[model samples]
Target: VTSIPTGCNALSGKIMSGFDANRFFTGDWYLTHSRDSEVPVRCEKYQTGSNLQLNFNGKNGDVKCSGSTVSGNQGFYSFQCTTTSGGSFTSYMAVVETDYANYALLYRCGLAGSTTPKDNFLLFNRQSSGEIPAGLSTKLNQLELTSLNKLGCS
Candidate 1:
């Protein structure tokens, strides 16, 4: 994956060290908010050797996901995610925060068709009651993203 978009200044190099992708991304997660109007989403991630797999479920539809990550600058990571159906798109995620167990803050830029980029944010937690760390709301606001929604986990 290429470097993060030019405008993600606050997020750049924000990745923390000792991030264990295999352990961190495995199991279920709650999607508190999203750019899409979809009210809720549930995600499950697992690892098969070095390959990463994900499943996202919501009212819109489910997506089959697969990706891999490579250690990049310092604590940062370069990873790719591809959707296998309807409105298929590939996104490369840049890390902002990850405790390697509970929560993660990631960013991605999508190229659906146009030459310009469509940026998005993700805040993931292992549990339904997990809290979003401070300062992320401000960052999301700067990105013109909606505030995080509370959605209990499965």
Candidate 2:
């Protein structure tokens, strides 16, 4: 009787519907906006069969994480990451929305210290002009996800 591991509160309505990882993981996703001020400048989500791999560089640091696809729940995804440098983690990500070519609204959870299970939403652009996605604020508000801000540093 094994249980799926989670680093944060895995709440409902945050996940996507009919997610096609093959299509979604084309290349890099630029950080354009976020619910938290701190965010990565770069993120690459590339698929390896049913496996999932993500690499991101942020203010905290950078790492390459590889893991298997979500099996316990449909439309919901989770993964374990071992930092190449000498760290480790478990992360959960939900695809709120995505055009795959233009934009994506993603939600993720992080825990620092068993300190806080930080829930944050991020907007990714296929190509960034250092601009916020149009109407994104209202869209997030409609989704009941507020407090989004444009990322200036990255």
Candidate 3:
């Protein structure tokens, strides 16, 4: 579990596919934070069903969930547990937005590889304008194309 010391910057990096969430902290998957000098991104989410909560930053606080999910920074999806007094993790969904005015998403996946990468996550800018930075469109395009190719889309 290598945490890229981005310190205080907007991060944009890839978490290799097939990452095992349980083995993430054990060093099986690579987790690198981007070093780009940008504002810390904010996040938001909308859960599909009931019994869910969202938290932000390194702090454990609940955001205003319109329905079943929260939309704000510190992107995390949690379920309200009756057995416990607080929220418990249900799933770590993809981020929704950031401070950079980007739309993020976590494409659902079902690992089929022999060596699934740990820390399975992918962050992306959904909108076209936000998808590529000025003068970096070409590089970003290549990356996007590669990602599409790898998604195993039907």
Candidate 4:
């Protein structure tokens, strides 16, 4: 079981039947609410052999993710970020700072998502190129700057 929010009851049901996803997302799990919702998100086990793969088309780019987490480290989730316009694959590593702290690469090289209180584990900060890194603080800073531009109004 992914340590999804305890309030994600509706989301859990959606995860089961694949329905009503927006209401249940609070943090790292909320993808942008849009017209197309047929995208796939499945679970794969890590050590016990339950790994899953998720492919995301970020804005104009493509990303493929694989792996899982059963309990501890050695639990690796990998994503290969590529551009739809045609480019190379950039490597990204997910690091959890606390219960909900880490940076994810989304869209271009955009840095999105947050581990903050309201948005803890809530991914909302997909960024443009040249913004993500392995350092926690740096990623946070990059995410912050990118967020200002989105403004959440458009």
Candidate 5:
């Protein structure tokens, strides 16, 4: 088990269980909120042979990447992403809370020892609901990300 910091020990407790990555992440997800930018983002998660395909759409335009999930002690996952444009970045995502049907609160952070480490909080919905889930504000408060917005797909 990878040890988290004392301040974030509560974060570890937020991890979910029975995380069958293959099954849980096999569809389109709307990026309802983010701590990084207000431009909006959406992701299409699918399987490509033995790996996972992550299709992203946002301010920078469309980006397609291949990812593989590495599981941890709980439902924590490390997604290793390699973009078709020859860029690579790894993000660790954990299910903070979810009903496995409506919406999921996801905590995403860049790899600890990466050249450019980053972190962000995101709310992923099963559909474009345009409504933030309850208690999400409290969770974002913990991360110190104040403002959030939803994006409409073109």
Candidate 6:
């Protein structure tokens, strides 16, 4: 069996600081892109999955994930609901950019018990329809993260 991710020693992505946690939290945002997109939304979700079915919700700097499901892309771990068919994992996250009203670009390095890094980039929008931040392409380019594509929930 694969061990779940605990904490990566350090992130490989540029970790930008000074983003307000309050503004970033306390709202309903949807993933416009992510490695999590690989986990097709569980059937009752009735869609291509990802944020298209289960979106993001935060409050006071805490994460409120959706579904009784676990999600992971290309590593030995996953995010599971415990109440569903999934595996559990953990990771340290970094905010690449966020205006607090429209979009957020993030980086996560899920370091499993093995300490092997399974990292990824996450892009989110205030609306499921999708939103892109100014200068985002450059940031994505700088991070050399070009594997992401706009996620379609509809």
Q: Worst 10-residue stretch by lDDT in candidate 4? A: 7-16
- Residue pairs clashing, model 2: none
lDDT of 2 by residue, 35-138 (tens): 77744334433223334777766344666666554565445566666655678877666677786777788777756567666777778777655445564656
Each model's total of backbone clashes: 0, 0, 15, 20, 0, 5
**Which residue pairs collide, candidate 1?**
none
Predicted candidate 3 versus true structure: per-residue lDDT over 43-148, tens digit per residue: 3222222233222222234423221222431333323322123543222233322222332333221222323422333433333223322443344454452242
User: Candidate 6 at 152: error in angstroms?
Assistant: 3.3
- Ranking the candidates on TM-score from highest down gives 2, 5, 1, 6, 4, 3
Q: What is the C-alpha lDDT of each candidate?
A: 0.55, 0.63, 0.28, 0.30, 0.57, 0.51
Q: TM-score each candidate.
A: 0.61, 0.73, 0.23, 0.27, 0.64, 0.57
Clashing pairs in 5: none
Of 2 and 5, which scores higher on lDDT? Answer: 2
lDDT (tens digit, per residue) of candidate 6 on 1-154: 2433444423433555665655665556677777555454311111124431222322212232332212332212233321232434444455677777777787656544565777667886777766456568787777776667656643
Distance from true position, residue 37, model 4, in Å?
Answer: 24
Tens digits of per-residue lDDT for model 4 on 1-154?
3332222111211111222222221232323321112334322111111234445555455555443432321222333444566754432223222222232322211123433211222233222222223443454464443342221211
Q: Candidate 5, which ten residues in sequence have the lowest lDDT sum?
A: 1-10
Best by TM-score: 2
Instruction: Give the per-residue lDDT of model 1 (tens digit) for 21-139.
Output: 67656667665544543333444332323356666663446665566543443433433444444645555565565665676676655564676666667777766566676656665
Segments of candidate 3 deviating more than 4 angstroms: 1-47, 53-73, 78-91, 98-104, 107-117, 122-146, 149-153
What C-alpha lDDT, on a 0 to 100 scale, does residue 76 get in candidate 6? 20
Q: Which ten residues in a row have the lowest lDDT in candidate 2?
A: 41-50
lDDT, candidate 6, at 39: 50
Which of candidates 4 and 6 reaches a greater TM-score?
A: 6
- The residue-level lDDT of candidate 3 at 97 comes to 27
